[PDB]
Write an enzyme that holds these catalytic residues in place. Structure first.
Site, PDB file in Angstrom:
ATOM      1  N   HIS A  58       0.907  -1.242  -0.026  1.00 65.14           N
ATOM      2  CA  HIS A  58       0.160  -0.127   0.006  1.00 65.14           C
ATOM      3  C   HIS A  58       0.848   1.199  -0.167  1.00 65.14           C
ATOM      4  O   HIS A  58       1.769   1.465   0.882  1.00 65.14           O
ATOM      5  CB  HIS A  58      -1.108   0.047   1.141  1.00 65.14           C
ATOM      6  CG  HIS A  58      -1.892   0.981   1.206  1.00 65.14           C
ATOM      7  ND1 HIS A  58      -2.102   1.918   2.363  1.00 65.14           N
ATOM      8  CD2 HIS A  58      -2.713   1.515   0.393  1.00 65.14           C
ATOM      9  CE1 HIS A  58      -3.104   2.734   2.228  1.00 65.14           C
ATOM     10  NE2 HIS A  58      -3.707   2.434   0.835  1.00 65.14           N
ATOM     11  N   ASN A  59       0.472   2.228  -1.012  1.00 65.16           N
ATOM     12  CA  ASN A  59       1.351   3.382  -1.143  1.00 65.16           C
ATOM     13  C   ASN A  59       2.866   3.193  -1.331  1.00 65.16           C
ATOM     14  O   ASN A  59       3.593   3.550  -0.439  1.00 65.16           O
ATOM     15  CB  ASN A  59       1.216   4.557   0.068  1.00 65.16           C
ATOM     16  CG  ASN A  59      -0.391   4.248   0.534  1.00 65.16           C
ATOM     17  OD1 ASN A  59      -0.779   4.371   1.473  1.00 65.16           O
ATOM     18  ND2 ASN A  59      -1.146   4.715  -0.663  1.00 65.16           N
TER      19      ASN A  59
ATOM     20  N   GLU B 289       1.224  -0.009  -5.627  1.00 69.82           N
ATOM     21  CA  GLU B 289       0.357   1.145  -5.891  1.00 69.82           C
ATOM     22  C   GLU B 289       1.074   2.366  -6.511  1.00 69.82           C
ATOM     23  O   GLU B 289       1.937   2.533  -6.239  1.00 69.82           O
ATOM     24  CB  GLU B 289      -0.215   1.615  -4.306  1.00 69.82           C
ATOM     25  CG  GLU B 289      -1.387   2.527  -4.559  1.00 69.82           C
ATOM     26  CD  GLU B 289      -1.731   2.923  -3.186  1.00 69.82           C
ATOM     27  OE1 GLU B 289      -1.539   2.342  -2.073  1.00 69.82           O
ATOM     28  OE2 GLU B 289      -2.795   3.959  -2.979  1.00 69.82           O
TER      29      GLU B 289
ATOM     30  N   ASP C 224      -0.426   6.104  -7.096  1.00 66.55           N
ATOM     31  CA  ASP C 224      -1.156   7.155  -6.906  1.00 66.55           C
ATOM     32  C   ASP C 224      -0.908   8.153  -7.964  1.00 66.55           C
ATOM     33  O   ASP C 224       0.058   9.097  -7.940  1.00 66.55           O
ATOM     34  CB  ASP C 224      -1.191   7.640  -5.700  1.00 66.55           C
ATOM     35  CG  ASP C 224      -1.606   6.463  -5.042  1.00 66.55           C
ATOM     36  OD1 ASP C 224      -3.109   6.152  -4.899  1.00 66.55           O
ATOM     37  OD2 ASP C 224      -1.180   6.442  -3.437  1.00 66.55           O
TER      38      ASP C 224
ATOM     39  N   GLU D 242      -3.909   3.852  -9.223  1.00 68.91           N
ATOM     40  CA  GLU D 242      -5.031   4.767  -8.523  1.00 68.91           C
ATOM     41  C   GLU D 242      -5.023   6.036  -9.370  1.00 68.91           C
ATOM     42  O   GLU D 242      -4.047   6.811  -9.173  1.00 68.91           O
ATOM     43  CB  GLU D 242      -4.612   5.104  -7.051  1.00 68.91           C
ATOM     44  CG  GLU D 242      -6.065   5.271  -6.555  1.00 68.91           C
ATOM     45  CD  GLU D 242      -5.726   5.266  -4.828  1.00 68.91           C
ATOM     46  OE1 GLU D 242      -6.172   6.032  -4.103  1.00 68.91           O
ATOM     47  OE2 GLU D 242      -5.166   4.170  -4.533  1.00 68.91           O
TER      48      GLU D 242
END
Length: 1206
Positions: free
Chosen positions: A318-319, A348, A350, A397
């Site tokens: 995550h991130n 991930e 973003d 994302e």
């Protein structure tokens, strides 16, 4: 290359070349001699032979990157350099690897360097443990003395021993060992040092051999082992393997011979039948090839890679771009490289709006360093399949515009090209294709154009400067506004950092020489400090010679003194000692004296003794000789903020208890001046109290809090005015100290307490030594060991604090909350306190001091002021089809997010941790059915701004395969994740068992259905190389635990060993520990070693996460990893593992062992019937005493029964 060619390469390596090195800290690249010391296994960069700037462990090398592909290589000087003559060495145990960037002169040099380091790293995993012991000893020796000395001294040994985390029992002890080794002028050689090591480790833990000295499997025939001189043979070792380690390959004697000659790694052992000694056998017992880890799971199994992808746990993060806390971490594609090298299959991305037209990867609407997308995609292509070569699914994302989306898609189609998965592998797809069918394929999960159509939010957050009144500075705190509540976090800046008189008050000389006899007693009392008494000089203020300094110096067996003569020359002072040895500058006096050889026919020896004030505290602000406990308490009521510390002297005592603010509490800890060293705790030896303060202002005294502000008297005054921060702090009683029972402890003596797991014991008094007086039913105030239980206090306040963590803007890490509704803002264009950009929050009531917040920019000042001012007054986006078509599988579908019926393998479920946990609580089987075909992203909620991860295990049982966990953190759950995805050759694609893929299985079975398939029996015996965290020597204790399901999760710590971490021994008298795990595949064995400080709080030393399926039986060594699941050098435990099958008879007996819990939980319920209740009827409670021991026997018996059995 050939073996002799490799030898020439490695000798060129060992010779060393003056080569260019780059760094982001030091802008100018410098030429340093880089060379490998093979015996230490260190690549070292130095300026000269004696002065080595830096070390690099070869086993610590994780990646070698050719060319200019590092943050150090972005410099302009690197542009002048050429890529064929540039590379980087990546090393370190931290998530962001330390980067040693070497630019080369010639391409031949560079290629030789890459080949040589690859060879050295390859032999690094091939090096036997005795060789690495040799290497580590040589590392200690070349570290304490920079000249690469091959000999060792008495004192020097007195300093290595604390550094390698062993407490010197006595000077006589080390002297005796020196003697038996053979000491010439109490000096040893490196080989004699190694013999000293063998003696220490063997003697300290010779009682380990008792287990083999036992009389059941005398096959190993361990005997007469008392002395290390004792030895065994190849036949003995193979019997050991076939019986204790239960090795089926051990049937062949030749393989055993090969492994033994590999382990010994000594050419002098030419015996046809190799033989080793009892001490060498013990060293093998903590060796790498005796690892409890199973090697057949270190190889990728193709039969376990040909199955629908829905049946594969996949390592996700995550991130992933972030390297620290989500709030202010430095995003870097090197994090992507790291995670891919660990074996992640999902990272991930973003992708936010980019000013250049190219998306920037960072945590949007937050303050994190932005990174370019093209560099990211290049890095992903470069190092996605360099390890494990299995498909990685890019978690995209999307938060950019359509133009950036076109750039997105074209970048994927260009950089990745064939690597990118564009078309389905087979068109008539009924389910997910196998990872084997997806060899090196880039799958993009990203919101598809579901709406189709032909052709076609933040909260106010950021860093702010709060006006501190204690120090009159601007302390920067991260502030987030949630529901008109601005919360500020801790200091962000905190992580960032004459020719006379001055010499009189310098470290070299301070004060108190009113008589030459005073200096004689100062340095004579300092004479017995070290071995060589020649290292003794002092400057002083003369008593008879007017206005003159005087060097009081030792002279080859006696103490003397001679005036440093002073003259007035050229209008300046001029001090001279020899006819032509002289200067005028004191700051330069120290250096040219250090280079000075105190040379004179009279003076030929130089000593360089920087001996300081025997007591600077004497003149110290935080030091308070006449300050007592009461005085401290009162004055800490005046300063109730954590970090406020004073060192108050106990009246008529050599111990100077530190009165300090810990969690709003007045805590004391004595520092006893043992001999001359100020000792904190038991072995925290400090030169002086100012050194104590300087060390503990960057080292944790007690949990997170650190020595932050010394509380000066004056200070009392400045804070004569208080409520600067309002101490939001955390915004029943403790006579019982309610504890839970770790395991079934039996009453050894009538004053010992017999009980069962999970027992609620109350009215517990913590008597030292681990024995606690506690009440338990009819057994009121009875002892029980601290290791066989666990403490769970009623931190209701802490629970409210965690609820705050839940609804807090900053969530965790918040250092204060201020309700913007009941405040007003006044903007100061002229500003306040040397800061033009200031907005002051003045509360409704003037009684609350107005708090000044400052920014760095006028426009951001305006934005903050506008937001808080507003508070006070109170398909169309057309996602790129070019990108959408790239989404072959796993296309987000928000329309049916709650729907888990009729799963589609081309669909994906994006869930936050709380939503997924709620779904598990409601319907596990339905989500299991979905993920039988569908797939799941479970990712942390927005409140986890501190990179803390959730418990990902319940998700895995329900088949939630894809669990984004923050790879930058060091918590327990990421060690769990590394353990899980190390399986199947560290590929990250783990095949779930057959039970998972069938619908009849219950992801959370009922307690009645739960049946034993594995009752492990573990026994810790010893350890080696436990790492040290702080000055004080670690007092280690191991906790073995199964962190499987809510029925598997069980803990057990052991008796703490005091002041011994180099060779810590646990008592053989401890009982075998039984872990009854109902499911073997979904379970993890974890040996967490902690250390106990003077506050007895456990502190994480290391962990030993290993899958149960990978756990082998026998007397197995357990390699120890750090919080980043990286093997630290030589740190290993030993465990007597015993694999155990649930036979039909055993099952019946294990149905009895379930009857155990079925009615002992009611036994605990009758302990709870009289938990703290007293107004009760003694009818059943006293008549469950029958029940009580009935259960006690019932089980212990039939368990030690099967024990006796296997």
């Amino acid at each position: 290359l050939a073996e002799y060619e490799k030898s020439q390469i490695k000798r060129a390596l060992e010779l060393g070349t003056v080569m260019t090195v780059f760094s982001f800290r030091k802008s100018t690249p410098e030429r340093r001699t880089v060379q490998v010391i093979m015996e230490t296994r260190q690549v070292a960069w130095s300026k000269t032979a004696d002065k080595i700037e830096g070390f690099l462990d070869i086993m610590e090398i994780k990646e070698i990157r050719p060319g200019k592909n590092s943050k150090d290589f972005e410099r302009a000087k690197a542009v002048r350099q050429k890529e064929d003559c540039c590379f980087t060495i990546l090393y370190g145990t931290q998530f962001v690897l330390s980067t040693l960037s070497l630019a080369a002169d010639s391409k031949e040099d560079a290629v030789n360097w890459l080949s040589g380091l690859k060879i050295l790293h390859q032999e690094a995993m091939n090096a036997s443990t005795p060789t690495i012991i040799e290497s580590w000893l040589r590392k200690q020796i070349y570290s304490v003395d920079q000249t690469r000395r091959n000999s060792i001294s008495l004192r020097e040994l007195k300093t290595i021993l604390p550094l390698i985390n062993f407490k010197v029992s006595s000077a006589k002890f080390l002297k005796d060992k020196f003697v038996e080794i053979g000491a010439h002028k109490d000096e040893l050689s490196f080989e004699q040092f190694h013999l000293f090591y063998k003696k220490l480790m063997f003697e300290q833990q010779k009682s380990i051999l008792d287990e083999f000295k036992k009389d059941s499997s005398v096959f190993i025939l361990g005997n007469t082992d008392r002395p290390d001189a004792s030895a065994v043979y190849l036949h003995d070792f193979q019997r050991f393997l076939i019986h204790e380690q239960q090795e089926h390959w051990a049937q062949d004697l030749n393989k055993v011979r090969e492994r033994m000659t590999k382990f010994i790694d000594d050419t002098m052992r030419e015996t046809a039948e190799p033989f080793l000694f009892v001490d060498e056998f013990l060293t093998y017992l903590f060796s790498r090839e005796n690892s409890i880890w199973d090697e057949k799971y270190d190889a990728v199994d193709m039969q376990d890679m040909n199955n629908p992808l829905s049946h594969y746990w996949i390592s996700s993060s995550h991130n992933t771009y972030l390297t620290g806390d989500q709030l202010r971490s430095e995003s870097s594609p090197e994090a992507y490289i790291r995670c891919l090298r660990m074996g992640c299959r999902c990272i991930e991305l973003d992708c936010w709006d980019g000013p250049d037209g190219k998306p920037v990867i960072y945590h949007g609407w937050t303050r994190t360093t932005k990174i370019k997308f093209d560099d990211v995609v290049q890095a992903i292509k470069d190092h996605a399949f360099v390890t494990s070569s299995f498909p990685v699914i890019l978690s995209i994302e999307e938060h950019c515009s359509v133009e950036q989306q076109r750039h997105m898609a074209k970048a994927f189609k260009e950089v990745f090209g064939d690597l990118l998965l564009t078309k389905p592998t087979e068109a008539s797809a009924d389910q997910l294709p196998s990872p084997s069918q997806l060899r090196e394929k880039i799958i993009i999960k990203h919101k598809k154009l579901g709406p189709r159509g032909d052709v076609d939010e933040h909260k106010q957050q950021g860093e702010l400067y709060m006006w501190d009144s204690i120090d009159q500075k601007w302390t920067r705190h991260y502030c987030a506004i949630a529901d008109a509540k601005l919360s500020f976090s801790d200091d962000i800046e905190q992580t960032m950092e004459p020719p006379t008189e001055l010499h009189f008050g310098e470290k070299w000389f301070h004060k108190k020489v009113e008589k030459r006899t005073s200096a004689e007693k100062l340095l004579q009392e300092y004479c017995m400090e070290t071995g060589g008494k020649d290292g003794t000089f002092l400057v002083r203020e003369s008593e008879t010679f007017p206005n003159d300094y005087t060097l009081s110096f030792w002279r080859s067996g006696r103490v003397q003194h001679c005036r440093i003569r002073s003259t007035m020359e050229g209008g300046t002072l001029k001090y001279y000692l020899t006819d032509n040895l002289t200067f005028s500058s004191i700051y330069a006096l120290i250096q040219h004296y250090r280079e000075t050889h105190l040379r004179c026919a009279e003076f030929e020896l130089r000593l360089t003794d920087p001996v300081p004030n025997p007591n600077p505290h004497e003149s110290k602000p935080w030091y308070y000789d006449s300050l007592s406990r009461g005085e401290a308490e009162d004055m800490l009521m005046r300063i109730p903020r954590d970090g406020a510390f004073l060192i108050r002297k106990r009246e008529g005592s050599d111990s100077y208890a530190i009165t300090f603010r810990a969690r709003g509490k007045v805590k004391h800890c004595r520092i006893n001046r043992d001999g001359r060293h100020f000792v904190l705790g038991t072995s925290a030896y400090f030169e002086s109290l100012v050194e104590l303060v300087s060390y503990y202002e960057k080292h944790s005294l007690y949990r997170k809090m650190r020595l932050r502000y010394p509380v000066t008297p004056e200070l009392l005054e400045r804070y004569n005015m208080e409520r600067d921060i309002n101490s939001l702090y955390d915004v029943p009683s403790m006579p019982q100290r309610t504890v839970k029972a770790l395991y079934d402890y039996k009453a050894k003596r009538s004053d010992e307490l017999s009980f069962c797991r999970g027992a609620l014991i109350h009215n517990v008094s913590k008597e030292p030594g681990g024995w606690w007086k506690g009440d338990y039913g009819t057994r009121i105030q009875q002892y029980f060991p601290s290791n066989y239980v666990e403490d769970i206090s009623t931190a209701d306040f802490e629970e409210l604090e965690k609820q705050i963590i839940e609804d807090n803007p900053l969530g965790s890490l918040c250092r204060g909350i201020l309700d913007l509704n009941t405040y007003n803002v006044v903007k100061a264009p002229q500003g306040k306190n040397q800061k033009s950009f200031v907005f002051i929050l003045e509360p409704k009531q003037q009684g609350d001091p107005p708090v000044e917040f400052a920014t760095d920019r006028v426009e951001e000042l305006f934005e903050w002021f506008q937001s808080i001012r507003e508070i006070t007054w109170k398909k169309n986006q057309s996602i790129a089809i070019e990108l959408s078509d790239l989404v072959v599988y796993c296309k987000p579908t928000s329309k049916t997010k709650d729907n888990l019926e009729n799963p589609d393998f081309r669909e994906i479920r994006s869930f936050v941790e709380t939503k997924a946990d709620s779904i598990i609580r409601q319907k596990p089987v339905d989500l299991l059915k979905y993920n039988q075909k569908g797939l799941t992203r479970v990712y942390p909620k927005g409140q986890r701004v501190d990179s803390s991860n959730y418990d990902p295990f319940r998700l895995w049982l329900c088949g939630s395969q894809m669990v984004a966990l923050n790879f930058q953190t060091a918590d327990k759950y990421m060690q769990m994740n590394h353990a899980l995805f190390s399986l199947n050759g560290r590929t990250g694609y783990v095949l779930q068992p057959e039970s998972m893929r069938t619908e009849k299985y219950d992801p959370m079975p009922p307690e009645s259905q739960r049946k034993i398939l594995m009752t492990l029996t573990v026994k810790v015996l010893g350890a080696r190389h436990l790492p040290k965290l702080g000055r004080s020597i670690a007092c280690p204790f191991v906790e073995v635990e199964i962190c499987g399901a809510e029925y598997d999760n069980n803990k057990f710590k052991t008796t703490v060993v005091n002041d011994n971490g180099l060779s810590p021994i646990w008592a053989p008298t401890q009982e075998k520990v039984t872990f009854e795990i109902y499911d073997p595949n979904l379970a993890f064995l974890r040996f967490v070693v902690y250390e106990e400080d003077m506050f007895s709080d456990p502190n994480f030393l290391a962990h030993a996460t290993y899958p149960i399926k990978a756990v082998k039986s026998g007397f197995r060594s357990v390699p120890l990893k750090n919080g980043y699941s990286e093997d630290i050098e030589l740190a290993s435990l030993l465990v007597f593992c015993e694999m155990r099958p649930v036979l039909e008879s055993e099952e019946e007996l294990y149905s009895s062992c379930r009857q155990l819990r079925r009615r002992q939980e009611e036994l605990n319920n009758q302990l709870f019937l009289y938990d703290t209740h007293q107004n009760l009827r003694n009818a059943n409670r006293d008549a469950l005493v029958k029940e009580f021991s009935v259960n006690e026997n019932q089980l212990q018996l039939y368990q030690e029964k099967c024990n006796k059995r296997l």
